[PDB]
Design a binder for these strands. Structure first.
Ligand SMILES: [K+]
Ligand SMILES: [K+]
Ligand SMILES: [K+]
Ligand SMILES: [K+]
Ligand SMILES: [K+]
Ligand SMILES: [K+]
Ligand SMILES: [K+]
Ligand SMILES: [K+]
Ligand SMILES: [Mg+2]
Ligand SMILES: [Mg+2]
Ligand SMILES: [Mg+2]
Ligand SMILES: [Mg+2]
Ligand SMILES: [Mg+2]
Ligand SMILES: [Mg+2]
Ligand SMILES: [Mg+2]
Ligand SMILES: [Mg+2]
Ligand SMILES: [Mg+2]
Ligand SMILES: [Mg+2]
Ligand SMILES: [Mg+2]
Ligand SMILES: [Mg+2]
Ligand SMILES: [Mg+2]
Ligand SMILES: [Mg+2]
Ligand SMILES: [Mg+2]
Ligand SMILES: [Mg+2]
Ligand SMILES: [Mg+2]
Ligand SMILES: [Mg+2]
Ligand SMILES: [Mg+2]
Ligand SMILES: [Mg+2]
Ligand SMILES: [Mg+2]
Ligand SMILES: [Mg+2]
Ligand SMILES: [Mg+2]
Ligand SMILES: [Mg+2]
Lengths: 193, 124, 54, 127, 201, 90
RNA sequence: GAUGAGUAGGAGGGCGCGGCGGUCGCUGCAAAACCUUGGGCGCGAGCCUGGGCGGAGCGGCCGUCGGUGCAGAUCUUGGUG
RNA sequence: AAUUGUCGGGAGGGAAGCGGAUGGGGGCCGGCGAUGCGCCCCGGUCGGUGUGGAACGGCGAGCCGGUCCGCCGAUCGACUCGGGGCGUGGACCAGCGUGGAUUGGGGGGGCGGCCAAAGCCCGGGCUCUCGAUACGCCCGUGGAACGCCGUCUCCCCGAUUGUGGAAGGCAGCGCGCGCCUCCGGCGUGCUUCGGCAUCUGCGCGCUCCGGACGCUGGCCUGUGGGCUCCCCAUUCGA
C-alpha cells in the first residue's frame, strides 16, 4: 500500500503542475513537511545559545544527522544555528537508505541496530508501527506519531562526505556548505551514507 | 569529539552493597538479591536497598512508636530494617509479629511476654 | 473550550487532542495567472546617493 | 600436555615504558615514573617524546598472563605444591622457585612427569 | 513427475513467478480436491564407556551455514586455449589448456614434444589466457583426473606412454596452423618498452 | 512465587544482502521481481521495434500552452522607467 | 549499550620496604645481598625465572603496625670526575 | 655506583642522547616445533553372573548401595604390555579457492521529469538578407538520436578484516503429498487484464539466512624459525 501511495503522489504532483500550465496559472507546491539536518562544524568554541540548540536537536557530534518536522517553532530554532548545520528536504530514497543502513532504535536508552522488525515493535508497537516500512512511512509523511517514531531513531552517525565539502565556513548560497540546500541535501546524503 | 558531560557517564554514587563485613548481613544480602531478581516484587527491592545502608540510615524504632503504627493491623507483620528498642513510656503491649535486624534485650522480652514473636529477615 | 471539545468527543467515542500547534507548512494550491510585472536591477546614478538626491 | 588456550596472543606493545631522561642521568632509574612537572613535554604528550603508559595498552583478558608456550605460570616450592596443578595441567605450568635445592628439584621434576605438568625451568642447576 | 523447474530465477534467489502463481503451478488446488478438500498432513521423520574423562569441558565450534562452491573458470580460458605460465620452473612457456579438474586446477599439456611440458596441473591464478585456440576435439583425457597427479626418482614408463598418446592427437592439430609449432616452442618474455597492462593476449 | 528461570546480531546491510532485506520488508521481493520483469519487456520491445495516450485536440492545446509559457519566460522588460539611461540601454 | 583531554585539587583500586600476631614453606645437594648482551609476565608501580658471585640465613599468604618509597631543597655526609 | 685501564665489537664532515619504523650484524631461545590417535590378531600379563563373609555408607523401623575377600557359573574385558597390518595427523609460515562484514573504483540497462526538453531531420506556411546568399517566426498527437536531473536495477575488480564457539533459529524459496504434450499447460476469488501474500498446509531439503571455512605446499636440530635482548645504519619525529 505504501509503495502505491508514493507513486501516486509523484504522479499527482506532475498532473497538477501540468494542469496549472494548461490554464495559464501557477501551482504552488506544498511546503516541505520534513527536514534532514546534518552538523558540519565541530564542538570547539561553542557559543552557549548554539550549544543548547544543537543539543535539543540531538546533534552532539559533527556529521550526525536527524529528521525534524517543519513548523515555525522548529524553523526559528534552526535559523539560530545556521552556520553550524546544513539541511534540506529528504526524498524517499534518502529516508530508506538512512533507516535501512544506519538506522538504530533507542530501546530503554540503548542504541539497538534495526536488524529485525521486533525491535521496532518493541517500542513503537503501541503506535501501530510494527515494521521498518511503517517507520519509513511515518517519517516521510510526518504522520500523527512522528514525534515518537522520530525520537525512537537514534541520531544517525554519518561518515565524512565522499568527495569532501566546498567551504563549511560559508553559506550554501555563497558557494559554501551551511544552511538550507533544499532538495540538494539528497546529493549530500548519498556521499555521507 | 562528542558534546556530553563526563563522557555521558553518571556522576552519582549509591551503595551497591553493604559496607559492613558482618557475615550474617552478607548472607541476608545474598538471600534478598535472589528474591528481588526472581520475583520482581517492589517490597523485596526496597528491603535489599535498605540492607546496604549505613547505621545512621537505619535508625532505631521505639516499641511505643511501633505499637501506635501497628494499631488496627494485628494480622499484618511489621518489618523494620533496623533495631527495635524498648520504651518505658508504653504500658500495654499487644501481641504483634515483628521482623527486625536486631531487638534490644528489653524489647524482645516485652514482645515475647505479650504473646508476640520476634522474627529475622530469613524467617520473614 | 478544551473541556467542551473533549466532552463532545467523549460522547461519540472519538479520542482527540486539544493541544495548540505552531504554524505548519501550507498545502499546495493553484494561483490564477495575471499580468506579470518584470523587475530588473536599476542602473546606478551617483546623484541619487543621498536622501532626495544632490 | 596440550594447552587449552586457542586465541592468538596480541601484544599491543612489546617495548617497555622507560622513565624520561633515565638515559641522561645515571641516578634516574629506568622504572617508570609519571612526570609531574609543569612544563614537562612528556607529560603534555608532545609528539616525538617518550610515551606514557595508559589503560588503552591493556592486553586481551582472554590471553592475559599467558606465556609464549600457551600456559599460565604457577610457582612451586616443593612436591606437595606441585600436586595442586594436577587438574589444571592444560592451563597452568609450574616453575620451580629460584631458591629450591637441586636435590629437591629432581623430586619435583620427577613428580611433574608423572602428573604431566609442564615445568618451565626443569633444567635448572642440574649440571 | 515434473520434468523441469517450475520457477526459473530472474536473479540469484528471486523466482520469476509469485506465490499466487506458484500455487496454481504447484497444483495444491488439485491436491486439495483429491484429499477431501484438505491438504494432507504428514508426520516428522522418526555409547562405549569413555577411557578418559577430561578435566576441562570440550568446546565445539558454532555451526557455519556457508558451504564452499566449486572454483570458477575464467571466461578467457576455454578448451584448446593457449596459456602462458607465469610462475614455477615452466614460467613463460606456452601450453595448451585441456580441461579443468574437479579440484579447480587446470589440466595443461606442452605438448611435451614441442616444449617439454608434460601433462601438468597449473593453478588458474598463475596463468594468462591468450586468444589463440588449437582444436582438441581428438584429444581424450577422460582417464586423467586429480588422482593421476597424486604422490605415493624415476618417472614410470606408463606415464611416458600416456603422454605420447595424448600428445600424438594434438600434434596434428598444431601442425595445421602455420607457425603454431614454433609459437608453442618459444617462451613469452617482456622486452624494453613492453607494458603488460597494454598487451593484447 | 519465583518467576520461571530465564548475543549481539552482526548488523548486515539490507541494501546489499537480499535475505536481510526480505526479513525486514517481505514486499521487497515483489518489487524486485516486477522491476526485473518490467525491464525485460522494455528491452525485448526495443529490439522488435514495437511501436498515444492523449487526444489529438488535447495535444495541440498542450503544445500551445507550453509554447505561450515559454514566451513569457524569455520576455524582457521594456526598460522605460530608466529615462536617464535610454540611450545606454538601447 | 554508551563512552575515553586534564594543571591546582579530591577519591578509588593496586605495587614496594621493615616489624608484630598467625599460617604455608625454602636453605651448606648453597639463604640474603650483589652482577649479567640469559628468558618471560604485567598498561604500570613491579613480579617470576636461567647463569654467575657469595657462604648463612630467607620467603609466600591473612591480619595488623610504622622513623615505609627521592633527581632536585646554592639539601646532609662520604666518594669520584 | 660514580670514575679509570686494558682487550674485543662498532660508530664519527661544528654536539650527543631520545620517540617511532624497518633493515644489517650479533647474542639468545628446543614447552623454539608434533610424531600421536582409532580400528584389527599374535603372544604375554591382569581382572571377570549368582550365592557366602569383613568393614561401612545414602535416604530416613525399613528400603536403597558401593568397596574388599572367598566360592560357583560365565567365559569376555582391560593393559603409558611387546610386535605386525590398515586408516588417520601436530607447531609455524606461505599460496590458492569459496563466502561474510566494511570500503574504494569501473561498466551497462529500464523508467520518469522539462517549452510533455531545446535542437537536428522530414513535410507544410510565412519572412526575404551584408559576416551578404541570410536573420529568424509559426505549425505536425511526423521521424531518428542526445543533454541535464531524479529514480529502479544488473554485472565486474582491488583493499582491510573473521571478533564469537550455547543455537540448524529467524526470513525467503525449492522438491514431494494431484494430472499434463514439461522454457510451459490444467481449479476458485480479485484485477488497472500486466497481474495478485485470494486460496500459499505438512514432510524433507536449499539459500545473499542468529560473526570463516576449506584445500595445497614449504619447514621441523638446518646456512632453519622466532625474539620484547645487544650494537649499528637509514627515513620521519624530537
Ligand atoms: K612468616
Ligand atoms: K635476572
Ligand atoms: K606486613
Ligand atoms: K671496559
Ligand atoms: K539511469
Ligand atoms: K575478503
Ligand atoms: K620449522
Ligand atoms: K633513527
Ligand atoms: Mg575555530
Ligand atoms: Mg558517533
Ligand atoms: Mg578518493
Ligand atoms: Mg577545503
Ligand atoms: Mg570563524
Ligand atoms: Mg571518543
Ligand atoms: Mg572530564
Ligand atoms: Mg611488556
Ligand atoms: Mg604551563
Ligand atoms: Mg640464583
Ligand atoms: Mg581522563
Ligand atoms: Mg619483606
Ligand atoms: Mg650493562
Ligand atoms: Mg614479595
Ligand atoms: Mg622502626
Ligand atoms: Mg622518613
Ligand atoms: Mg640522590
Ligand atoms: Mg621533585
Ligand atoms: Mg649540591
Ligand atoms: Mg660534598
Ligand atoms: Mg677534582
Ligand atoms: Mg663501574
Ligand atoms: Mg529521457
Ligand atoms: Mg573465531
Amino acid at each position: 500500500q505504501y509503495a502505491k501511495e508514493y507513486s501516486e503522489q509523484e504522479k499527482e504532483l506532475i498532473r497538477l503542475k501540468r494542469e496549472a500550465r494548461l490554464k495559464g496559472g501557477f501551482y504552488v507546491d506544498p511546503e516541505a513537511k520534513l527536514l534532514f539536518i546534518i552538523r558540519i562544524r565541530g564542538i570547539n568554541a561553542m557559543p552557549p545559545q548554539t550549544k543548547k540548540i544543537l543539543q535539543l536537536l540531538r546533534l552532539r557530534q559533527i556529521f550526525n544527522g536527524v529528521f525534524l518536522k517543519v513548523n515555525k517553532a522548529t524553523v526559528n530554532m534552526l535559523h539560530r544555528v545556521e552556520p553550524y548545520v546544513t539541511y534540506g528536504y529528504p526524498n524517499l530514497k534518502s529516508i530508506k537508505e538512512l533507516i535501512y543502513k544506519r538506522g538504530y532504535g533507542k530501546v530503554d536508552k540503548q542504541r539497538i541496530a534495526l536488524t529485525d522488525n521486533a525491535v521496532v515493535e518493541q517500542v513503537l508497537g503501541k503506535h501501530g508501527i510494527i515494521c521498518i516500512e511503517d517507520l519509513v512511512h511515518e517519517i516521510i509523511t510526518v504522520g500523527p506519531h512522528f514525534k515518537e517514531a522520530n525520537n525512537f531513531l537514534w541520531p544517525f552517525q554519518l561518515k565524512a562526505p565522499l568527495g569532501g565539502l566546498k567551504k563549511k565556513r560559508n553559506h550554501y548560497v555563497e558557494g559554501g556548505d551551511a544552511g538550507n540546500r533544499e532538495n540538494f541535501i539528497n546529493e549530500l546524503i548519498r556521499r555521507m551514507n | 569529539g562528542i558534546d556530553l558531560v563526563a563522557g555521558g557517564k553518571s556522576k552519582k554514587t549509591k551503595r551497591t552493597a553493604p559496607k559492613s563485613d558482618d557475615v550474617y548481613l552478607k548472607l541476608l544480602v545474598k538471600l534478598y538479591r535472589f528474591l528481588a531478581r526472581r520475583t520482581g516484587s517492589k517490597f523485596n527491592a526496597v528491603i535489599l536497598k535498605r540492607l546496604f545502608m549505613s547505621k545512621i540510615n537505619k535508625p532505631p524504632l521505639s516499641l511505643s512508636r511501633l505499637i501506635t503504627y501497628a494499631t488496627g493491623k494485628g494480622d499484618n507483620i511489621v518489618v523494620l530494617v533496623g533495631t527495635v528498642t524498648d520504651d518505658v513510656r508504653a504500658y500495654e503491649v499487644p501481641k504483634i509479629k515483628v521482623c527486625a535486624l536486631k531487638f534490644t534485650e528489653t524489647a524482645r522480652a516485652r514482645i515475647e511476654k505479650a504473646g508476640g514473636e520476634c522474627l529475622t529477615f530469613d524467617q520473614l | 473550550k478544551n473541556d467542551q471539545l473533549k466532552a463532545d468527543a467523549k460522547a461519540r467515542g472519538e479520542v482527540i487532542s486539544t493541544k495548540r500547534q505552531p504554524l505548519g507548512p501550507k498545502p499546495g494550491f493553484m494561483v490564477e495567472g495575471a499580468t506579470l510585472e518584470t523587475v530588473t536591477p536599476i542602473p546606478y546614478d551617483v546623484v541619487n546617493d543621498l536622501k532626495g538626491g544632490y | 600436555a596440550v594447552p587449552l588456550l586457542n586465541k592468538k596472543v596480541v601484544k599491543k606493545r612489546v617495548k617497555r615504558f622507560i622513565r624520561p631522561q633515565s638515559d641522561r642521568r645515571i641516578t634516574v632509574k629506568e622504572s617508570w615514573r609519571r612526570p609531574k612537572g609543569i612544563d614537562s613535554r612528556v607529560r603534555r604528550k608532545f609528539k616525538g617524546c617518550v610515551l606514557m603508559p595508559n589503560i588503552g595498552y591493556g592486553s586481551d583478558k582472554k590471553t592475559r598472563h599467558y606465556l609464549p608456550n600457551g600456559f599460565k605460570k604457577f610457582v612451586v616450592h616443593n612436591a606437595s605444591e606441585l600436586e595442586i596443578l594436577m587438574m589444571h595441567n592444560r592451563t597452568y605450568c609450574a616453575e620451580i622457585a629460584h631458591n629450591v635445592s637441586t636435590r629437591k628439584r629432581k623430586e619435583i621434576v620427577e613428580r611433574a612427569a608423572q602428573l604431566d605438568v609442564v615445568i618451565t625451568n626443569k633444567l635448572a642447576r642440574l649440571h | 513427475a515434473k520434468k523441469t523447474i517450475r520457477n526459473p530465477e530472474l536473479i540469484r534467489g528471486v523466482g520469476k513467478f509469485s506465490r499466487s502463481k506458484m500455487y496454481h503451478k504447484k497444483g495444491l488446488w488439485a491436491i486439495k480436491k483429491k484429499n477431501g478438500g484438505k491438504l494432507p498432513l504428514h508426520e516428522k521423520k522418526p555409547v562405549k564407556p569413555p577411557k578418559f574423562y577430561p578435566a576441562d569441558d570440550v568446546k565445539k565450534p558454532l555451526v557455519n551455514k556457508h558451504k564452499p562452491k566449486p572454483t570458477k573458470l575464467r571466461a578467457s580460458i576455454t578448451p584448446g586455449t593457449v596459456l602462458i605460465i607465469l610462475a614455477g620452473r615452466f614460467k613463460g612457456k606456452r601450453v595448451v589448456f585441456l580441461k579443468q579438474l574437479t579440484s579447480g586446477l587446470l589440466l595443461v599439456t606442452g605438448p611435451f614434444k614441442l616444449n617439454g611440458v608434460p601433462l601438468r596441473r597449473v593453478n588458474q591464478a598463475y596463468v594468462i589466457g591468450t586468444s589463440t585456440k588449437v582444436d582438441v576435439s581428438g584429444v581424450n583425457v577422460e582417464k586423467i583426473d586429480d588422482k593421476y597427479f597424486a604422490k605415493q626418482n624415476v618417472l614410470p614408463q606408463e606415464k611416458k606412454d600416456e603422454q605420447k598418446t595424448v600428445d600424438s592427437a594434438l600434434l596434428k592439430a598444431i601442425e595445421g596452423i602455420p607457425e603454431l609449432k614454433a609459437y608453442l616452442s618459444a617462451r613469452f618474455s617482456l622486452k624494453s618498452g613492453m607494458k603488460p597492462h597494454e598487451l593484447v593476449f | 512465587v519465583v518467576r520461571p528461570i530465564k548475543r549481539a546480531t552482526l548488523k548486515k546491510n539490507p541494501l546489499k544482502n537480499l535475505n536481510v532485506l526480505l526479513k525486514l520488508n517481505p514486499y521487497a521481493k515483489t518489487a524486485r521481481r516486477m522491476s526485473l520483469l518490467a525491464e525485460a519487456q522494455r528491452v525485448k520491445a526495443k529490439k522488435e521495434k514495437l511501436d498515444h495516450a492523449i487526444t489529438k485536440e488535447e495535444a495541440s492545446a498542450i503544445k500551445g500552452a507550453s509554447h505561450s509559457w515559454y514566451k513569457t519566460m524569455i520576455s524582457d522588460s521594456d526598460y522605460a522607467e530608466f529615462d536617464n539611461f535610454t540611450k545606454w540601454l538601447g
